[PDB]
């Protein structure tokens, strides 16, 4: 369960190869990459706190789908349109568990991991909670 | 809808970048890579026929989730343990459609795309239908 928050960009290929190297006997790999939509974003985490939340999310995915492995890399800092934001990769013996766990981790990440976005309000620059709400995902995964 | 069957190996990064370059305004990308499990595999397709089936699968994904784009690269030939077999990548405005369409394409590919595996039987070398059966996926996607 390799989880990282960084400012540098990540290499999906390299992260996928390392996950496979840690899981020599299973071969179904699902991944997700989110990128700043071209519709600047300044993202900040809570050092230590946010990583622990991501570790808890990956651990819960492992409880629900025994035998998977999970990698998460999330960026922070000043991110431009088209920049990569986050990648989640999971591996399993079969594609069903790989897809489900990858989407579960993304849903839980987007709704619960502590991140903040900088926004300029009339008072001035503020940091606004970047967590999303997804009520259909919560019902899907059995939580209220 | 870029669909290819080839003997050469593929580069997930390069394929993902090209898909994003064809979809400048949406940023949620889901992908799947299947690899020969380390438990040689000789895979063959039906030239023309198999590509058309993959195109039909991607078109149906586009009918179900308007606004997505889909890329499929499938390998054939003599594939060793740990070799990449197949990649499917989808992009959408939001992660829900990206994940669902990617899994749908993989399920339909694995159960319906014409591929054959070489096997040595008592009579001798034979080519056996490599399509899988998934009855839970068929129910999930509304087909009987
Ligand atoms: Br790490
Ligand atoms: Br995202
Ligand atoms: Br599979
Ligand atoms: Br092509
Ligand atoms: Br596969
Ligand atoms: Br998203």
Automatic annotation (TrEMBL), chains A, B:
InterPro entries: MoaE_sf, Mopterin_biosynth_MoaE. The keyword Transferase applies. It comes from the Bacteria. Keywords: Molybdenum cofactor biosynthesis, Transferase. One of its GO terms (molecular function) is molybdopterin synthase activity. GO terms for biological process: Mo-molybdopterin cofactor biosynthetic process. Its EC number is 2.8.1.12. Gene3D superfamilies: Molybdopterin biosynthesis MoaE subunit (3.90.1170.40). Pfam families: MoaE. It catalyses: 2 [molybdopterin-synthase sulfur-carrier protein]-C-terminal-Gly-aminoethanethioate + cyclic pyranopterin phosphate + H2O = molybdopterin + 2 [molybdopterin-synthase sulfur-carrier protein]-C-terminal Gly-Gly + 2 H(+). Pathway: Cofactor biosynthesis; molybdopterin biosynthesis. Belongs to the MoaE family. Heterotetramer of 2 MoaD subunits and 2 MoaE subunits. Also stable as homodimer. The enzyme changes between these two forms during catalysis. This is Molybdopterin synthase catalytic subunit. It comes from Burkholderia ambifaria (strain MC40-6).
């Amino acid at each position: 369960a390799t989880i990282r928050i960084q400012t540098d960009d990540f290499d999906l290929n390299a992260e996928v190869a390392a996950l496979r190297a840690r899981n020599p006997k299973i071969g179904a790999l699902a991944c997700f990459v989110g990128t700043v939509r071209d519709l600047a974003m300044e993202l900040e985490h809570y050092p230590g706190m946010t990583e622990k939340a991501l570790e808890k999310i990956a651990a819960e995915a492992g409880r629900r789908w025994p035998g998977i492995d999970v990698a998460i890399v999330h960026r922070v800092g000043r991110l431009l349109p088209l920049d990569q934001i986050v990648m989640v990769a999971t591996v399993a013996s079969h594609r069903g568990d790989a897809f489900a766990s990858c989407e579960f981790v993304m849903d839980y990440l987007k709704t619960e991991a502590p991140f903040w976005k900088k926004e300029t309000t009339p008072d001035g620059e503020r940091w606004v909670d970047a967590r999303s709400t997804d009520d259909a995902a919560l019902a899907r995964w059995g939580v209220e």
